[PDB]
Design a protein around this nucleic acid. Structure first.
Lengths: 775, 775
DNA sequence: TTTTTTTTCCCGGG
DNA sequence: TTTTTTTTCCCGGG
């Protein structure tokens, strides 16, 4: 019955699942598994709370289908970290029978090909490209199941409409243009008010349940009253020690065994509340017991001290007690340790802005939401229900809590957020029909014409009848026109064929809207190209961010004047000019009408490209944030996104027909991949030896600094003298004084100390002193 | 004794040599072979007339040394064609025992490496690079013999001083810096007046002989008197039919069996005298017999008719009789047939400017030199003795003749040219000692410092004592300075080390003087580079010719105005400007003082680069000479020299340290190699199908035009539609009308007929008509 | 005044 | 108002 053994599973699979400690299944799982003909063929849509085991049925169905019919499967997931964890889980579970679970998430590309794989775990945007390729090459029939998580994002999002672009396409191509269920689709949502309409569109069943192992109480508190539930008093809060009374609330939670989670509305605000709690804990417990261990807490200090960026000041006066912060201004490795400590004991109190609301699974006891207004706007209903989902620890306590501290002035705002479920899911396509067509519809029809699925306008009119007309119920004729004067398709006397620009957009998969910006940058490049410095090629591969940081305009104008002579020639060629910056940095704003749109996009990518230049040329990170307004967590994200963008413009140029430019872009992929050196780490222990001098000195020495570095002085000086490019140091018959000086200040030893010969004696003398201390 | 069998030779070698029909050897060969200790070790220098067998001793010595001691050998030869003939001779002779005779001449690079070879046949400039590489890599000891032909060119020439740069270097490095003869050197000259001084410098023997199988008489004729020899009358010339009386002189030669050779002082002049003789032959022999065959003469007409350039008008009215011309304004294949006919019968009379004076071996009977003044200057003594050397046919007649037609006004000019032997050989280095150092000395010391043979100035002072001080008998100190401010070597506190620019010059081996021009062109390129068209990359690989044609300045200014918008941007970047051409083309000349030297070199390479652009883009050769003042023989030479130059700038950039530019230059080596298509020849039989459309149409059709071309019209139109690069056809927010139009006139079908769709119907209709005629 | 995520791929014998 | 000559190199299994 409910026992896992009485369900027909492989022996190794059941043993592995019992190793985790799961034996029974809830009645709702069985009810939804035996709901109609979901088990054999057909599609399924259901919505269950996240606290209850939700992936049981999905894994059972995918295992059944894979073991019965040999066909590939997809496991589209929202984020990367959850995708990696799910990939590890699936591999460790199917590590015996043999599936070769492999993930496409992030830059972790598969070592093998898609054909050898059986189950692929991908993100939202890395499955659309896979399906597009499976359409371009006639191998679509390999697909046998598509599993989608978090279905309600298909309505409206920055990247959630890809589900609505993908599902209709696969269903139409597999069934409507071909004629049991050839492709099975299952989905998960969160208590949608119109879940029936989604199931009918996909021709599926419908199961809705509401069962949680822990019955949490959303005990909203206002002032001293704990008026909650249906506006009824349950308890009265007394003023404990104070200097809102937030500190008193965490005290009773801290006492017995429990923990607190504070959701700040700002990063800094997390820091402010973290130090405040730390003061009270030490105030009257070191001069009731605080109940914390000290053997492992001091060990954690060691890990936080060995990071290259070093420990943080606010992370030293609060970590000794169970207080810290987990905002986004931390290194991915540094922020991982804070999460690890909360996983089992040690730290007790925590703070966060939004990171632990979606992306990680860290349950705890009663959760404080603090103010009910975030960023000057009312809190979203979906966000509030997401935070309170993590207000219960499974298998330890019996009940959960969720106390929202709302000021007496507002009052009704908490009640409105307390009373409400969700909103109906829109289409994003609907918006306008006779007005300007949305960017989602333009990408919809262009992405099948390039694949050749639909050629005649009559055929494509059928396609639009399977995505939105049956969903919740001219535009096509106006959408075809937009693709015409923009040179995306070509028309004969009525058959449409892809052009070279249309094929380039699909292969690289940027967008049918931002491709018009990258194309204008590459076309302007083939009229003059600076080849001495590496800034003009760093401007064509810089990632395009809508808003990644508050671009300071006073500092940008300051760095504009101090640029060298050679690097100022790239600026005039790419488009950035001083006149625009004169109007800006003077309490200005954006504008419209085409021409002003190009000006803002040109200047925004230059500031990002300037930052990326310094990371290639060292410029230690402590001084990076001093000159450029940035953050430690933002710098790391830029490095990851720069490598992916460099290798994607290369595909754009290859399909476009331009072959000479492609070689230049492909050659630069090596330098942008920073990585971490391991063998060179021993050689990098020298003061005046950067990463660029390791390779040249490794050819001869390839040893430590004690005896290898103490081998003559002429050989060492000459070896590093010939590594630099030529860079002649005499004025030509057409150059200027500034041009030659920039060619003379580059050969100086760096940073930028003495002359060439003087550094040879300094390096040898410094090495001898270091050798004596070591020995 | 004199028999070849009694000399100790391999049986196969002697049988092969007897196959050619050579049995005995003259007494001078034995005398020079048994002269001192030349046979075992030591060096040899001798001078013999070219008519007598001169290579017997050289081949005997090289065979002896190779068969005795396993060591490589070199056979430096002046020209390429003679080098190829010598390579074929040596291979066919040593085709049995096993030597692997292989030549470096021209672009015919070896398939294997130098180590596997045993005997290498190289030109003058392709052995200096080999020796430089054998110095750079410590493998000099493989050399065991160096054979030099035409030694007297070492004195003064445009490229003859390389022998004086090479011999001293090898001798010094092998003997003076190391301590029997480790390396044996043999040489051939032509009756030098100071041959003793050359032998003592190389520490060799000396043999001088004067013996010719045919005793030619230099019967100079002036007016009607044949006053010759020591100014003595031998015969009186009577006036035969006339309209100088040049035609009458050839008549008696033509009659019995003999032939005539006329050395014109100009190309055209050869044409003028060729038609004149043809008129007289037909005048009174078709209305004594002319004595010529007609079966093979008509066959020769067929070969001259199938050339791509077609037959020549002046080559049709004189070829029916034994008259033609052999100037340099002919294709290498076309001019080969004329030489082949003269090899055995058929054609009897011939004309030439200088081609048959040095480079080919075509002996004949009495030779007429015509005027004794060439190009407004007195005839060179060496040139006159070179022409009369071919005034005797071996094995047919008994005596030769050489009649120089000198007008009665000059008279003494012929006597001075008749009485005289040669002039003493200079050094080219001597010229000036305290004055500006010659370009030969700068290259001399730079070429050993880079190799590291000499480091201290004391050591190098010894080097100059082995090349010229002992030859025919401050400069070194002034020569080192010139290499200093020009950044060719670097100096320490006295030891000199090569720089990056110095190593680049030796590897590519242009010159220590013209490298300063190529470097200034590449440095100017890394400040802006046009990547759309292929003219900016065609300007950096254009061969640098001192004077290859009379550059017309009126037409150059005309083509300057008609250039498109994109191609005029390259002109401003490279240096060519309208202002300079305004002063020129107005009865102007050259100038001096550095700045004017760069201006002339910039503009001269642009005219050559414009010509090379059309050859890549078809532009049939008949119209090539109409717009550009050129010649059929000059166009072919430009194509051969362009391919070699493209692959040599690549080596220059690799050693210089600039890696991004090297990739662009290396990618262009493929297009510059025109070649001849063989498989595509069948596909090229279509009117509207050039070489670029063969590859795209070969993917689908790959057949003839009868049935393969008659396969639908949409498929054919689309296939050639997508081959062109994108080349968008809409004006951008920053472009101009002219820029867009140049992007719209390129997609038109070419040439440059109807629109894109119209050509599809025209091609199909034209193919059907051609198919009907064939079938 | 916070939270994310695209691309194709070379090395060994010669 | 004619006659010449430099350079290093990739393709197959995956």
């Amino acid at each position: 019955k409910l026992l896992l053994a009485n369900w027909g599973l492989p022996k190794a699979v059941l043993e592995k699942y019992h190793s985790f400690g799961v034996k029974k299944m809830f009645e709702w799982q069985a009810e939804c598994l035996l709901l109609g003909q979901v088990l054999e063929g057909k599609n399924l849509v259901y919505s269950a709370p996240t606290s209850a085991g939700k992936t049981l049925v999905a894994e059972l169905l995918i295992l059944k289908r894979v073991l019965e019919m040999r066909k590939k499967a997809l496991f589209i997931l929202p984020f990367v970290s959850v995708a990696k964890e799910k990939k590890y889980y699936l591999q460790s579970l199917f590590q015996e029978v043999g599936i070769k679970v492999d993930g496409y998430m992030g830059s972790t590309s598969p070592s093998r090909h898609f054909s050898s794989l059986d189950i692929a775990v991908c993100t939202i945007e890395r499955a659309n490209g896979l399906i597009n390729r499976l359409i371009e090459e006639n191998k679509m029939d390999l697909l046998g199941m598509v599993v989608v998580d978090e279905l309600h994002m298909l309505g409206d999002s920055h990247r959630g409409y890809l589900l609505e672009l993908l599902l209709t396409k696969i269903c139409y191509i597999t069934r409507k243009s071909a004629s049991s269920n050839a492709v099975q689709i299952v989905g998960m949502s969160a208590t949608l008010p119109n879940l029936e309409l989604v199931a009918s569109w996909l021709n599926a069943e419908l199961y809705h349940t509401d069962f949680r192992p822990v019955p949490l109480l959303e005990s909203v508190k206002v002032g001293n009253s704990i008026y909650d539930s249906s506006m009824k008093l349950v308890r009265e809060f007394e003023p404990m020690l104070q200097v809102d009374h937030v500190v008193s609330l965490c005290y009773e939670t801290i006492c017995d065994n429990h923990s607190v989670l504070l959701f700040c509305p700002s990063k800094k605000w997390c820091e402010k509340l973290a130090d405040i709690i730390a003061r009270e804990f030490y105030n009257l417990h070191h001069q009731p017991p605080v109940i914390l261990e000290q053997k492992e807490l001091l060990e954690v200090m060691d890990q936080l001290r060995r990071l290259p960026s070093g420990l943080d000041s606010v992370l030293q006066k609060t970590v000794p007690w169970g207080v810290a912060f987990h905002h986004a201004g931390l290194t991915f490795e540094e922020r991982d340790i804070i999460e690890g400590a909360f996983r089992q004991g040690l730290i007790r109190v925590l703070a966060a802005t939004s990171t632990l609301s979606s992306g990680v699974n860290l349950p705890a006891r009663r959760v404080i939401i603090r103010t009910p207004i975030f960023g000057g706007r009312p809190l979203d209903i979906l966000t509030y229900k997401q935070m309170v989902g993590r207000a219960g620890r499974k298998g330890v306590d019996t009940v959960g809590e969720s106390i929202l501290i709302c000021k007496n002035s507002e009052k009704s705002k908490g009640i409105a957020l307390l009373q409400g479920s969700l909103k109906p899911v829109r289409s994003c396509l609907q918006r306008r029909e006779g007005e300007e067509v949305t960017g989602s519809m333009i990408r919809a029809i262009l992405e099948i014409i390039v694949g050749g699925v639909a050629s005649t306008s009559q055929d494509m009119h059928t396609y639009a009848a399977c995505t939105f007309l049956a969903a919740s119920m001219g535009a096509i004729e106006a959408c075809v026109m937009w693709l015409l004067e923009n040179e995306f398709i070509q028309s004969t006397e009525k058959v449409y064929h892809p052009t070279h620009l249309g094929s380039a957009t699909l292969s690289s998969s940027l967008s049918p809207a931002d491709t018009l910006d990258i194309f204008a940058d590459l076309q302007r490049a083939m009229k003059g190209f600076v080849l001495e410095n590496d800034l003009h090629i760093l401007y064509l591969v810089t990632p395009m961010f809508e808003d990644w940081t508050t671009i300071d305009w006073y500092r940008f104008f300051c760095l504009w004047e101090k640029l060298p002579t050679s690097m100022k020639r790239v600026a005039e060629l790419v488009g950035v000019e001083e006149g625009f910056l004169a109007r800006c940095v003077a309490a200005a704003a954006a504008a419209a009408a085409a021409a002003q749109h190009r000006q803002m996009a040109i200047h925004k990518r230059f500031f990002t490209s300037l930052v990326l230049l310094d990371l290639i040329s060292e410029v230690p990170l402590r001084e990076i944030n001093q000159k450029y307004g940035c953050n430690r967590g933002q710098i790391q994200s830029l490095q990851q996104s720069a490598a992916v963008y460099a290798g994607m413009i290369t595909v754009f140029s290859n399909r476009l027909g331009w072959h000479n430019m492609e070689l230049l872009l492909s050659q630069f992929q090596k330098r942008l991949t920073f990585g971490i050196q391991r063998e060179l780490c021993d050689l990098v222990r020298v003061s005046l030896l950067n990463a660029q001098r390791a390779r040249v000195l490794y050819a001869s020495g390839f040893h430590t600094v004690a005896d290898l570095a103490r081998a003559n002085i002429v050989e060492v000086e000459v070896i590093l003298k010939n590594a630099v490019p030529f860079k002649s140091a005499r004025k030509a018959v057409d150059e200027e004084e500034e041009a030659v000086e920039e060619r003379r200040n580059m050969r100086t030893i760096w940073r930028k100390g003495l002359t060439e010969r003087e550094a040879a004696a300094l390096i040898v003398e410094e090495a001898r002193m270091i050798l004596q201390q070591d020995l």
